[PDB]
Amino acid sequence: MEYRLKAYYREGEKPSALRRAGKLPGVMYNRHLNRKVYVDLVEFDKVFRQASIHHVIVLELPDGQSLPTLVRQVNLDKRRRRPEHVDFFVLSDEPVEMYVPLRFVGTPAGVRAGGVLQEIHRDILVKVSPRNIPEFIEVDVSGLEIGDSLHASDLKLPPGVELAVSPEETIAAVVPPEDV
Amino acid sequence: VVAVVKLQLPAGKATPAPPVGPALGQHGANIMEFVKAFNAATANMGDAIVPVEITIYADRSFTFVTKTPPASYLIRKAAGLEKGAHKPGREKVGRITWEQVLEIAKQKMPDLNTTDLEAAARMIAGSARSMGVE
Amino acid sequence: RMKYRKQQRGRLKGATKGGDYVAFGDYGLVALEPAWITAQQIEAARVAMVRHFRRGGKIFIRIFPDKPYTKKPLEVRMGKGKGNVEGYVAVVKPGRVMFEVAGVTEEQAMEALRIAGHKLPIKTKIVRRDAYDEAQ
Amino acid sequence: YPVGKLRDALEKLKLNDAALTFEPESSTALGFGFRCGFLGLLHAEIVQERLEREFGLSLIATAPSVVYKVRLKSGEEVEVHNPADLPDPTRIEEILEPYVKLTIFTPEEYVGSLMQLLQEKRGRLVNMNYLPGAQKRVELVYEAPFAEILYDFHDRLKSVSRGYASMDYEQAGYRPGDLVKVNVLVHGEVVDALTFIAHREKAYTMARAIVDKLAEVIPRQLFEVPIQAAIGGKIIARATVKALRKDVLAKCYGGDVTRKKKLLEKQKEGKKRLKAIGKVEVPQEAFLA
Amino acid sequence: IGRLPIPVPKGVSVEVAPGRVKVKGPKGELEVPVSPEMRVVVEEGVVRVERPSDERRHKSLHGLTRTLIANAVKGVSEGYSKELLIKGIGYRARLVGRALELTVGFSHPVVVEPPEGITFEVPEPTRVRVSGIDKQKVGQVAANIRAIRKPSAYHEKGIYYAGEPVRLKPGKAG
Amino acid sequence: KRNVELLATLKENLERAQGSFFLVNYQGLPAKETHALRQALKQNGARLFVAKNTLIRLALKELGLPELDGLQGPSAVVFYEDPVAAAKTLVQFAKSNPKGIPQVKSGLLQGQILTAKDVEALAELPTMDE
Amino acid sequence: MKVRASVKRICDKCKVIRRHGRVYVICENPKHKQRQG
RNA sequence: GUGGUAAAGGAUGUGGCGCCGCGAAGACAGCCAGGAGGUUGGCUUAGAAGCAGCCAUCCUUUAAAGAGUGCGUAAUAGCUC
RNA sequence: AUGUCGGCUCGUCGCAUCCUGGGGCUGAAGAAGGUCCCAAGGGUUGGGCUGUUCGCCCAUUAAAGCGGCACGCGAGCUGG
């Protein structure tokens, strides 16, 4: 949830001058419903860190207009961190770009005894879920032991009805620290 | 003199050479060898830390009728806790149900301040620290 | 050390700007002032990390050595053409992000990074999963 | 320790005072009896200095020796041990040492500071009974090794307890305990080896000492021989003597890194060729004793 | 906050002067130099020091001012003084007249005169405390006489202030 | 959070369930030394909260909520906040009266109370041990 | 005990101090008297 | 006296920044006094009856609860918060 | 035409001090130390060997410094 003061400009000196003002340039775009819109940083940046945000739907309010959207991109700087350019994707009827955080809440078996580490792999996924998006998919496992890594098949999908991914694919892993 | 100081020891034994040593004559105690009396008195009651404050006094105080055992290990004694003798006490020796542990507080709550209402899981729940069963 | 089966043995020398970005376990370092970085510096690095994380904590490596390095003689007058090798630098232009989780909790990641990246030529900054990224 | 001349009027009896004679150790300088060091730290120094600037000549000052009653399989136990009779462990087990239990009368709290010192050779308590009469003084009994109590026990014990109470051994009941062996492998031909006992692994603090003797002016042109402390396992210490060499590349002061390269092989290849003929013969000259 | 309210009861004769405020008590006229931009005024017993502005300088100096003048009034109020405590048998001390005996350099003409408003109370060589007036020259003196043999990082032996328990290091052994 | 939320809330919660609250200056003894009297009514009966040890400002404005209409016979300075109300006060009070009076040098001077309905007198509380 | 750089605080009770362009770290324990200047 | 010549480095330098600290049911440093009773063993009980030494994650007072950080040692003992 | 090693004779200079001073810390009791800091005013010998600077080696001593200065100094020497 935030807003997003609109700006006419396209490409030139302006985005740079605005960054000098602290103000992300950005995009409002959806199935060729287009506009170029220019966010201010700071609070919209806390918003940006709010985790569900850049994932779960976020609303924004160009002048007084309201739109829902979920970020499709953030161009980073390379010379340093800090985002350079946000890209929105407003949601009409069906969204499919679904970038879902996982919450595996593993039952103990490996990290504690064998010392093996449950390395996160894909962290977050690409599924399909029109305006009813499930939050934290929760796939507990006691297979922490043995050095197995349960794949993408095992998620057992909650009503966000689709695996876009090719099924079964090391979604979450354990790696031995020194093999047991 | 006035060696009536406070010096706890281990319940139920005989020769107190590892605990006494400088905790008796050193300060100004007297005699020795109420070893037998330590047996004759405390070899019986409370395997839950039953030491008698060696009240330093002329002729060297005697044993029998200590004060009390205290500690959680009296307030919940029915167990032992040998565990950890090697390692940091993994598991085991931790259950005769919650329940025999509670019924053991019906008489395992001897002398203490004025007197609080409970000596079970309102203090055995401090043995929650003391033992292995938090 | 590593770099086996190079197909040449005399690369030139360029460097100026580029990079990568994300953490891959989520406490990684990231260089600022850009430089060569030879393998020796890496053995020193991952060792400082290892020995600080209970000699087995999980360190994804990161960058990797490639371009050959050489002085050529001993002090012999230059003239002959360019040969030999002993350095084997990777190049790290700014923003390259070394990848170093260890599930090792909070500060130890930080501190092991302090040592480790301080066992290296270039000033560096400590970061983790944050401004994020996604595509397909 | 005499350096040399034996007997020479074994001035032992002299006049009262815990005299001593005979019973001398060998190892690498016999020196006959090694006594003459009873009472305090004075009687020893005094007597040693007496015959020194009075009658005796340039004498030694070695430390004390041991025995080690090993137990070689198929019977052994004793077998008369000598600072050289090291028959490895082929004698089955060890079990050799004099674990004497003395009775220290440390009062006040000299125990705390002393109890730690008594650990000179892994000691233990036997009967800790609070002395009677009143207080102040105290008692103490351990099972240290007569080998780790002989030298350096009083001068150090008196300082830990301000120099109170006393101490007396019992020399009763043997014992095994770790011993080990330590031999200084000079150059690479191995000589004397000196060694010690390695009992409980002590050569360490002694290995990097006896070996790293800096080499008694043993350079030999440019032998560069490395003096390592060969006790009983690969290598413990590592004392290498410096060679000599010659300012060979000191006349071609010019150019070309090739010229200064030739006058380097003759010195490098030669130094090695020598590492064959002679080794090292530096025993006398006041051993690192 | 706590940077302005000074109580000066008693019967003081404090008065301001161009950056050189003054105090007149029972026997002192103890001076109180200050920086003019802070500036102070006093009435009855209330004492009204003031802060020109809040760059760190003026505030910090402000605190000086309140402290220094406070030390003036408390100082002349009695004739302020510092406790002292020689210990460890290597000593003697005596008032002598207008310098101290002392005895600890063993070749010990360790003479030492009072400078000014100072005078030496010689009560027991195990005490010997010194009168003065202004606290800071009291300190200059306590430092001077304490300047000769105070530490003994092994066994106690020397001059001491009121007295630490006195940190030690273990002696030759034990 | 900062305000009435951490204990403060329940502070006058259960205490309000009664109608004869009390207060004392008890504290100034070593933890064990008055631990010995840290169970008076708790021995005389059960479930006492004697020596609750909140005080002024912490409860001095929170006393108005309590509707004792003025327990301010002890609110200033040290204040044990020991409720005579938790017990049905009578014979039990002596077990807390001897406990704070007989003990030590200045074992535990009382502030006052709200014993019964009307506030207990500063002397009468001292006067009526039972 | 000049260490003229570093100066990392270790007695942990340790005080840090600038003074006359220096950075002494004074501690109640004598060992820690580091001084980058 | 930086300016009027140098880096990794360290730095409650100093000015200003955007978050983070109010608990007037009143924090902060100083304090004043109390820092807990069963809260005391697993092994070492040579001591762990915390802060020798290889786990102790819940109740008592609730001021809060130190499963207990710190001196220290035979532990303890008496000592910060 | 910029006479090149070494020695003599004369030097002066700096400090990254060998001694002499002044001080921290210690696994410093004292003494002897260790080790870093401030310290350039003075002092840093006599020999054997070799062309030798260098180096070991005798005798010591407070010590027996490291360097500059066209590897200081030949319109001043010697020339091994």
Helix, coil or strand: residue B10 = coil
Instruction: Please give the method by which this entry was determined.
Output: cryo-EM
User: What is the number of other CB atoms lying within 10 angstroms of the CB of residue E51?
Assistant: 16
**Using the CA of G4, which nucleotide's C1' is the nearest one?**
H10
Pairwise CA distance, residues D109 & D106, whole Å: 7
- The residue with tokens 């002494």 is G24
Q: Phi/psi of residue A84, each to 5°? A: -110, -35
CATH code linked to domain C24-132: 3.90.1170.10
Pairwise CA distance, residues B78 & B67, whole Å: 20
- The residue with tokens 């199935």 is A31
The enclosing H or E element of D103 equals none
Cβ of residue E172 near strand I, that is under 7 Å? yes
C-alpha distances in Å from residue D286, one per residue of D1, D3, D59, D155, F13: 11, 9, 11, 26, 91
Pairwise CA distance, residues D229 & D186, whole Å: 8
Helix, coil or strand: residue G18 = strand
Which one-letter amino acid corresponds to residue D128? M
C-alpha distances in Å from residue C100, one per residue of A77, A148, C28, C104, C112: 21, 22, 5, 10, 10
Instruction: Choose among F45, F122, F37, F121: nearest CA to F90.
Output: F45
Pairwise CA distance, residues F18 & F49, whole Å: 12
Q: Phi/psi of residue C49, each to 5°? A: -60, -50
Tell me whether residues E173 and D159 touch, CB distance under 8 A: yes
Q: How would you list the strands of the sheet with A73-76, edge to edge?
A: A34-37, A26-29, A83-88, A73-76
Which one-letter amino acid corresponds to residue E75? G
CB–CB contacts below 8 A, D to E:
12
Go through C31-44 and write b for each residue having 16 or more CB atoms within 10 A of its CB, e for each that does not.
beebbbbbbebbee
- HSE on the CB side for F74, CA within 13 Å? 30
The DSSP string of F76-87 is SSS-----TTSS
Residue nearest to nucleotide H25 (CA to C1'): F58
C-alpha distances in Å from residue D217, one per residue of C36, D61, D242, F12: 48, 22, 10, 90
- What residues does each domain of chain C span? 24-132
The residues facing E130 across adjacent strands are E82, E120
Phi-psi region of D223 (alpha: psi -120 to 50; beta: other; left: phi over 0): alpha
Residues of D in contact with B22 (CB under 8 A): 109, 130
CB–CB contacts below 8 A, B to D:
16
- What residues does each domain of chain B span? 1-67, 68-134
Residues of E in contact with D162 (CB under 8 A): 174
Pairwise CA distance, residues D89 & C39, whole Å: 47
Q: Phi/psi of residue D43, each to 5°? A: -45, -40
Are the beta carbons of D13 and D19 closer than 8 angstroms?
yes
> Which parts of B8-110 fold into alpha helices (H)?
35-42, 72-75, 97-103
Pairwise CA distance, residues G37 & G20, whole Å: 9
Helix, coil or strand: residue F10 = helix
Pairwise CA distance, residues D33 & D107, whole Å: 36
Q: B1-67 architecture in CATH?
A: 2-Layer Sandwich (3.30)
Antiparallel, parallel or unpaired: β E158-160 and E85-87? antiparallel
Helix, coil or strand: residue D113 = helix
For C59, counting Cβ atoms within 10 Å of its Cβ (0-12 exposed, 13-18 middle, 19+ buried), the class is: buried
Preceding-residue numbers of gaps in chain B (C–N over 2.5 Å): none
Kindly state whether E154 is in contact with chain D, defined as any CB-CB distance less than 8 angstroms.
no
The dihedral through the CA atoms of C4, C6, C10, C15 has a sign that is negative
Residues of D in contact with C74 (CB under 8 A): 257, 261
The dihedral through the CA atoms of D38, D39, D42, D43 has a sign that is negative
- Report, in ranges, which bases of strand I sit under 7 Å from a protein C-beta: 24-30, 36-37, 52-54, 56-57, 71
Pairwise CA distance, residues D97 & D200, whole Å: 11
Tell me whether residues C76 and D257 touch, CB distance under 8 A: yes
Q: Phi/psi of residue E99, each to 5°? A: -170, 160
The enclosing H or E element of A42 equals helix A42-49
Are the beta carbons of D240 and D185 closer than 8 angstroms?
no
C-alpha distances in Å from residue D194, one per residue of D80, D85, D120, D198, G30: 18, 11, 22, 12, 44
User: What is the number of other CB atoms lying within 10 angstroms of the CB of residue E67?
Assistant: 12
The C1' atom of H4 and the CA atom of C123 lie apart, in whole Å, by 30
> Which parts of chain E fold into alpha helices (H)?
56-78, 135-145
Instruction: Choose among E126, E66, E58, E136: nearest CA to E90.
Output: E126
C-alpha distances in Å from residue F62, one per residue of B119, F55, F72, F79: 33, 10, 11, 14
For residue A43, the Cα-to-chain-centroid distance in whole angstroms is 18
Nearest beta carbon to residue B115 from set F32, F42, F47: F42
Minimal Cα–Cα distance from F109 to chain B, Å? Answer: 18
Do the chains C and D touch each other, judged by at least 3 C-beta pairs below 8 angstroms? yes
Pairwise CA distance, residues A122 & D67, whole Å: 70
Pairwise CA distance, residues C38 & C68, whole Å: 9
Are the beta carbons of E160 and E145 closer than 8 angstroms?
no
Cβ of residue G31 near strand I, that is under 7 Å? yes
Are the beta carbons of C67 and C89 closer than 8 angstroms?
yes
Go through A139-163 and write b for each residue having 16 or more CB atoms within 10 A of its CB, e for each that does not.
bebebbbeeebbbbeebeeeebeeb
Instruction: Choose among D181, D201, D194: nearest CA to D63.
Output: D194
Task: List residues of chain D with CB under 8 Å from any CB of chain B.
Answer: 109, 128-130, 132, 135
C-alpha distances in Å from residue A66, one per residue of A26, A61, A95, C63, F75: 16, 5, 18, 45, 57
Which one-letter amino acid corresponds to residue C54? R
The residues facing A137 across adjacent strands are A102
**At what resolution in Å was this solved?**
3.8
Residues of B in contact with D141 (CB under 8 A): none
Residues of B in contact with D135 (CB under 8 A): 25-26, 28
Quote the tokens at residue A91: 């949601």
* Euclidean distance between the first and the last CA atom of chain F, given in angstroms as a whole number: 41
Do the chains D and B touch each other, judged by at least 3 C-beta pairs below 8 angstroms? yes
For residue C1, the Cα-to-chain-centroid distance in whole angstroms is 12
- The residue with tokens 């005499």 is D2
Mutation to test the A interface, candidates C58, C92, C93, C127, most A Cβ within 10 Å: C58
Residues at the binding site of G are 11, 14, 27, 32
- The residue with tokens 């009396």 is B37
C-alpha distances in Å from residue F121, one per residue of B118, D189, F15, F22, F124: 33, 104, 20, 11, 5
For G11, counting Cβ atoms within 10 Å of its Cβ (0-12 exposed, 13-18 middle, 19+ buried), the class is: middle
Residues 6+ apart with CB under 8 A from B117: F39, F42, F46, F47, F48
Instruction: Choose among D60, D54, D72: nearest CA to D15.
Output: D54
The C1' atom of H29 and the CA atom of D207 lie apart, in whole Å, by 56
For residue E22, the Cα-to-chain-centroid distance in whole angstroms is 19
Pairwise CA distance, residues C101 & G24, whole Å: 37
Are the beta carbons of E148 and E84 closer than 8 angstroms?
no
Pairwise CA distance, residues A32 & E89, whole Å: 99
Q: Phi/psi of residue E77, each to 5°? A: -55, -40
D110, D111, D115, D116: CA torsion to nearest 10: -40
Are the beta carbons of E95 and E102 closer than 8 angstroms?
no
Minimal Cα–Cα distance from C33 to chain A, Å? Answer: 10
CATH class of B68-134: mainly alpha
CA D73, D65, D113: angle at the middle one, nearest 5?
105
